[PDB]
């Protein structure tokens, strides 16, 4: 049944952990499945973080070649993108929360960590890469999840990326798709330097039978918020920041044209196209709303 | 003179965008001719 995935097999998990097959291979984990509740909690926490960054922990299991995530819990850190982990407050919090959840019925174990990159894409920086490398070196398995709560609102689709790094000294053989991601100027050097040390798993979402029934029952009352959204007002500081970054990139492209990585004008054009398309979508939504509601003069 | 909150100004901006779009389309059309030029295959 669909709820079969919700059954936790302690014996099978112990057997898989004790018969680790990921050691012989390196790209062993290729699929990453996320429950509906975990994804929703991650997105709401990243959004409520605001403009700052938030990070939590993820509880799941493994089934052969795929990595399943069932739950996620935040940890305080006072957020504010502190230097790194914690003044030991989060260090106590992780163990305390796991122990408390053990005696209730949350009998799954940690599988990774998630954090937010609000406004500048979904990737692993240098410190993130070092953290994931260290975690995978000792406690295995482990997956990093990066969310973009601002681009999610702006584009209408969730911006979630699951990543896993490579061992020290390992040179992956080509096979780089490298789809384009807009990244500001002040955060481009780190992305360029630390880009071949990790790979992105294919992420899919799942939900239970009761969850599906409840969502299909809830849509009958939730259809209002789609028609009363007005996305052009909630995201204006983000658009202003995007325009500032685009102007700086255009200045750099003009400097390269005057002088004597490659063709920065094309990248600036793609960024401008993305921003303008988002703005026009926001406007046409309001045009549709006006046509629906303001013209039906009794 | 005016504040920019009129359908007339909206139409003016629309006309300017239409002219720019036509300009770019012609640019691309005359660029592809150079692209498929045999002389523009040796270099």
């Amino acid at each position: 049944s669909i709820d079969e995935i919700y059954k936790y097999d302690k014996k099978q998990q112990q057997e898989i952990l004790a018969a680790k097959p990921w050691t012989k291979d390196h790209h062993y984990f290729k699929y990453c499945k996320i429950s509906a509740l975990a994804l929703l909690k991650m997105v709401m926490h990243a959004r409520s973080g605001g403009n700052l960054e938030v990070m939590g922990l993820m509880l799941g299991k493994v089934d052969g070649e795929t990595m399943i995530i069932m739950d996620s819990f935040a940890l305080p850190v006072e957020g504010t993108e502190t230097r790194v982990n914690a003044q030991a407050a989060a260090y106590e919090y992780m163990a305390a929360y796991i122990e408390n959840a053990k005696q209730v019925g949350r009998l799954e174990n940690a599988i990774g960590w998630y954090h937010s990159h609000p406004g500048y894409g979904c990737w692993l920086s240098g410190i993130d890469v070092s953290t994931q490398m260290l975690n995978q070196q000792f406690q295995e398995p482990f997956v990093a999840v990066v969310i973009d709560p601002t681009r999610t609102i702006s584009a209408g689709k969730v911006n979630l990326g699951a990543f896993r790094t490579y061992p020290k000294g390992y040179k992956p053989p080509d096979e780089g798709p490298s789809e384009y991601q807009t990244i500001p100027l002040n955060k481009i050097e780190d992305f360029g330097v630390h880009c071949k040390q990790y790979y992105a798993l294919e992420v899919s979402y799942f939900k239970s039978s009761l969850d599906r029934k409840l969502l299909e029952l809830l849509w009958n009352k939730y259809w209002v918020n789609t028609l009363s959204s007005s996305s052009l007002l909630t995201n204006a500081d983000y658009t202003t920041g995007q325009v500032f970054d685009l102007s700086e990139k255009l200045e750099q492209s003009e400097a390269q044209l005057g002088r004597g990585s490659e063709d920065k004008l094309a990248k600036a054009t793609r960024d401008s196209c993305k921003t303008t398309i988002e703005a026009i979508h926001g406007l046409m939504s309001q045009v549709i709303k006006d046509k629906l509601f303001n013209q039906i003069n009794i | 003179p005016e504040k920019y909150n009129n359908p007339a100004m909206l139409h003016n901006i629309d006309q300017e965008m239409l002219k720019c779009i036509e300009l770019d389309e012609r640019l691309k059309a005359m660029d592809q001719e150079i692209t498929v030029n045999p002389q523009f295959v040796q270099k």
Binding site: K221, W223, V224, N225, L227, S228, S230, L233, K289, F293 | -
Partner: protein
């Protein structure tokens, strides 16, 4: 809004001991009632002149202005005072968010009406819903 006659009735019903009044005036109950009246009128007016606020609160216009300014400074209520026109301005209710709220209210009305229809003629609404997909 608590009226002066109701306040007087409550004062008459109250025991003499409970009427704790400051020496300079402005008995505690009357001050609390005036502040409550101002805070409740904040929910009813876009902007109100000093004369009408004084008539509403049954106090002189100068005292009304002073109390409103003190309440605004202390952060209890939101607004700003235009002294030249003698007008206190409460919240603004911008046009586009008002449009969003009214669209939400209209859709809520549609939903409630559909529920009431389906709770009165169940067989008819079942037949209509069944024919809705076919037609």
């Amino acid at each position: 809004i608590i009226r002066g006659n109701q306040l007087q009735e409550f004062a008459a019903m109250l025991m003499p001991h409970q009427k704790a009044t400051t020496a300079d005036g402005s008995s505690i109950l009357d001050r609390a009632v005036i502040e409550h009246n101002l805070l409740s009128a904040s929910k009813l007016y876009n902007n109100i002149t000093f004369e009408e606020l004084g008539a509403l609160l049954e106090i002189p216009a100068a005292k009304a202005e002073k109390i409103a300014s003190q309440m605004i400074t202390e952060g209890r209520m939101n607004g700003f005072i235009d002294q030249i026109d003698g007008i206190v301005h409460f919240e603004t209710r911008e046009a586009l968010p008002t449009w969003d709220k009214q669209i939400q209210s209209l859709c809520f009305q549609v939903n409630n009406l559909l529920e009431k229809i389906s709770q009165t003629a169940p067989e008819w609404t079942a037949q209509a819903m069944e024919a809705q997909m076919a037609q």
